[PDB]
């Protein structure tokens, strides 16, 4: 890395974009003398499937059910130039519907504890809360706020003064709305993001078809000396086929659990709050995350702040005025090549250096690398104008 | 949840109360050819009890012994209108005494590693530190401060300006003192909070009585062919009785351990510091927690801040003055129906909007939802008065 | 602890020092009918060594490889009065070299996955980043800054206003440079800090020598009835000798792993960031930590802030002026025995109390313990001078 004792790097521009990521949460859960002894083995095989089945409902609850009472929104689409009408809530959202549309003989299939209706309700409650009130740390929602005022605090949390959001509100809203529209067409048109979920579904569709492809009709036709041989052979190979099936479900379940753990982590860290980690809940600095319902999983839309062009500015520890040293009240002192300004750290904002944004401590002989500039008050000009 | 693009919810009042909760920390720990073979089984049973016994002293140390050197207070009862004389330190506190007053044949009972005197010393040291100095993050106490100045920082930590404590110091102190008095009478009069500890004590009193109710006098009277039969039967049923006893102690010990883990968590999180989680160390926002000694456990008195009546105020992103946009320096802009004020976020405090509590950035054409108001300086009035 | 309702303890001076600690990270990893049955046992013994060998490279990566792309510095020695020329980068640093200079028959020794060159590169990248740019939270470096401006933020993080660093920059730099020079001579002269690493090295040097000290020459000379006896006895005792060796390596490996876990924790907590825990990454308040390469381990140089002399000042909640109560804008009000000043909390800095560093709320009848003083504005003096 390049370095210099008077060089400071400050971003001068930024963009906001919406990153879409899809995390699988749950897998389809299924169930299924010497004969009795085989029955014992069957039970153990079923137990393994049962343990998985519990885990799968285990996963669903950990990811979605982080709110205790369900909430719903009023018919508001415009939250300050921001278009939420295609993520909000069949009464499902238009985007969720895209995800839904695009993604015997002893063998039975179980229902989920949380059905599509319950999941839609939990997702709606989480989303309704995030947008209008915001969630607190501990339990429940916080207090109602318009919406830009919520974003303003998320900007402050990444070191950006609460004036950037409002000055660039039109640009931010347009970039947000554009990204949502692009996600609209992208998810439908190209099988990109919709990869992980389809893969999981295809795999057990295959596992089930394999299990199936792999007693009374024998007993009624064959005598004991032969019937027992055919029966024992069929039972053994079928138990082996089930063992293979169970093993495949267990391994895949482990991958789903790992994904569910991540989804739950993000839900509690950046959906119900804000992530401090960069490049975690989306590339760049996290501001907000809005959950969406999906087949066998959850989809997150991450709104992130990404800095752009950076410039090399000349800096100084402090400014000398009348022999006294003036230190910056909040920001740092930088030179644009002809004039000195005071700016915040994470975004170039050339404020004029005045006595109202500085404090006085020490002197010009003590401070190292101090520069000679003019730091003026807003009072004398008024005195000169008022009666002179 | 109801929502509106210009509606902000702000609390206008609050109350402070003391929540009492009781957490069990430790359980009474006890100990107890073919004959030798039974002896092996007895040893294994004793091992299980030994493992528990270690855990029980394990628990006590984790919860109470979080301070290395013992401290004591001066004879101060009044810490700024706050009455601490009935929680401070037989040299035990009057409240602790209420808790104390209200709550062979191979079988022996063990002493604790930390006796009542040692526990009283640790509790006194933790409490002495909390009240006068406050604890730091890492090791030891911080620096001596009166007391209201400690509370002031705990208020700041929940988003309330350090003026609320002082303006309402009389009301806060009265509510605190009242709560302690109520706890005084409540704990003594009604067997409510004093439930969990009594339950634990009663259970092993029963377990021990059961074990007891459930050799030489046989050998000296019966011949071998009969004596061995009676002896083997008695040993077997006694080993079974002990197995049941050990199992009961193990299960209960697990519940005690879970409770001890929670008590230790709270001790390090909200007693030696401040909890950020709402509704954890008491309902509402945590400010302080004072530990108290108790039979077989620890009692915490949590001082929490609870907001009350909320009003729906009309808000605006910024205020227009001379065509330039004025943004709030710290708080938000709200309207009470006739006038605009600037307040903090978590408590309604209608400060007059002046140039000294705002900053100027951008203009009235760019900001969305900007309102027309007057933002004035404190200088012109002085100029007009001084020489005009 | 002593206590009083109007006494506040404030530090008036400080020192900065460099604490050196050495943590071992990795251990030398090694490898090694009835005969075949013994071979099975040998394989199990080798497996245990293999598991250790994996762990040892496991440790190295966890501690050092926390940066993905390698970086190098420009030839800068002076970073603002701070001498870094003896810690920066044979192309190894002079201090690292001191550490390096001071610290068959079936038996083989394995190489590390990360060789000395790779470790030097990772260490250089971590150090290059720490000094010039500083690391961010999530991934990669942050933004380029001189260096004093980085320290200034680390001071702010411990409650000290960003003016202390600059006013005392000469004293801080001299204390830092002095400490590094002392470490220079200390590490070379006295076998103090260089204890843990030498101990680990000596122990397996001994383990290997012991293993060695503890077939065809028998078969070609002895007949079956005797040859088998000698051979079986030698194999058994050699397998026992190896079992002892493996056990010793496993136990020591556990100690190394515990140390590696700590080193990795510090690397991610206080090297790539800042520790909030006091007396963790060095005595006192942590500011910075610079890694250094070492034989079989890592060396950390911790730069810590230590407060010194404290005084007992008289304090007051607020100051009365014209019947209105004035509260401190940032700090606290203290009396030095003759005059009232406003200072920050963690360092005595007697600023003059003026209307520009206070705010007005409430009145002199409500506030408890309010004192009568003069709080003046900087305006009237200008009005009196300008035209009177
Ligand atoms: C790379 C980048 O961020 N470019 C933007 C540009 O698109 C935008 O028009 C301009 C508005 O001032 O800010 C900058
Ligand atoms: C619900 C509630 O907090 N009510 C209080 C009231 O008891 C108190 O007298 C008043 C003092 O201004 O503040 C409010
Ligand atoms: C214990 C201690 O910190 N003493 C220092 C002293 O060495 C230094 O000369 C002085 C400079 O003002 O500050 C103080
Ligand atoms: C949101 O986008 C839809 C198009 O999908 C459009 O019909 C609607 O008017 C937009 N609403 C706002 C507030 O922009
Ligand atoms: C800043 O300086 C570095 C080092 O010379 C250079 O690589 C970089 O491109 C410069 N940045 C700009 C915007 O010129
Ligand atoms: C610095 O900013 C001023 C505006 O205040 C501008 O006039 C000047 O040209 C800028 N200097 C450079 C080198 O861009
Ligand atoms: C920065 O480094 C240059 C040498 O390249 C030196 O002359 C100058 O005085 C240094 N300035 C500061 C503030 O250290
Ligand atoms: C500022 O001006 C004074 C003379 O008024 C001079 O002595 C001092 O060196 C100058 N400082 C700098 C950084 O040029
Ligand atoms: C505290 O309460 C007791 C009554 O239990 C009373 O006697 C004592 O005077 C009170 N002290 C203060 C400072 O209020
Ligand atoms: C604020 O508005 C909501 C929605 O209409 C209403 O339910 C609530 O009662 C109002 N609050 C007050 C104090 O009137
Ligand atoms: C708003 O506050 C002012 C006091 O500054 C008061 O006179 C006025 O009546 C209040 N308006 C309402 C609707 O309460
Ligand atoms: C708030 O919503 C109303 C529609 O109910 C609209 O007329 C008004 O312009 C919106 N104001 C803002 C700031 O969005
Ligand atoms: C403020 O007054 C100006 C005229 O001076 C007017 O053009 C502008 O629209 C007004 N703003 C609002 C929010 O009413
Ligand atoms: C750093 O110390 C070395 C002595 O080891 C000295 O030669 C060099 O000049 C010093 N550099 C600075 C900037 O002090
Ligand atoms: C502050 O007061 C305590 C209690 O009397 C005393 O022990 C301590 O030495 C005093 N500090 C100083 C610097 O005198
Ligand atoms: C308090 O500080 C002033 C300087 O503003 C000094 O003159 C005075 O002697 C100090 N008082 C004491 C007791 O040190
Ligand atoms: C401090 O305690 C003394 C008694 O030693 C009392 O007279 C004084 O009024 C108390 N001051 C405050 C602010 O509590
Ligand atoms: C301050 O002076 C007023 C008289 O102007 C007096 O009533 C009040 O008690 C004094 N306050 C203190 C703390 O001495």
Numbering used by the authors:
A (entry chain B), B (entry chain A), C (entry chain C): 705 to 736, 751 to 807, 813 to 826, 855 to 965, 977 to 1150
Paper text:
To understand the specificity of S-directed antibody responses elicited by vaccination or infection, we evaluated plasma IgG binding titers against thoroughly validated prefusion-stabilized SARS-CoV-2 S trimer, the S1 subunit, the NTD, the RBD, and the S2 subunit (fusion machinery) in the prefusion (S2(Pre)) and postfusion (S2(Post)) states. We determined a cryo–electron microscopy structure of S2(Pre) which is presented in more detail in Fig S2-S3 and Table S1. Vaccination with two doses of mRNA-1273, BNT162b2, NVX-COV2373, Ad26.COV2.S, AZD1222, and Sputnik V resulted in greater binding titers against S1 compared to S2(Pre) and S2(Pre) compared to S2(Post), whereas infection or two doses of BBIBP-CorV resulted in greater binding titers against S2(Post) compared to S2(Pre) and S2(Pre) compared to S1. Prefusion-stabilized vaccines therefore elicited comparable or greater prefusion S2 over postfusion S2-directed antibody responses, relative to other vaccines, with the exception of NVX-CoV2373 which was characterized by low S2(Pre) over S2(Post) antibody titers, possibly due to the vaccine formulation or later timing of blood draw post second dose. Although prefusion S2 antibody binding titers positively correlated with neutralization potency, postfusion S2 responses did not, indicating that antibodies targeting postfusion S are likely weak or not able to block viral entry. To obtain a quantitative understanding of the relationship between S conformation and plasma neutralizing activity, we depleted polyclonal antibodies using prefusion S, the S1 subunit, prefusion S2, or postfusion S2 from the plasma of vaccinees who received two doses of mRNA-1273 or of BNT162b2. Depletion of prefusion S or S1 subunit-targeting antibodies resulted in a near-complete loss of neutralizing activity whereas depletion using prefusion or postfusion S2 had no detectable impact. Furthermore, our data show that antibodies targeting the S1 subunit, and not the S2 subunit, account for vaccine-elicited plasma neutralizing activity. It is therefore S1 subunit shedding rather than S2 conformational changes associated with the prefusion to postfusion transition that leads to a marked loss of potency due to the fact that most neutralizing antibodies target the RBD and the NTD.
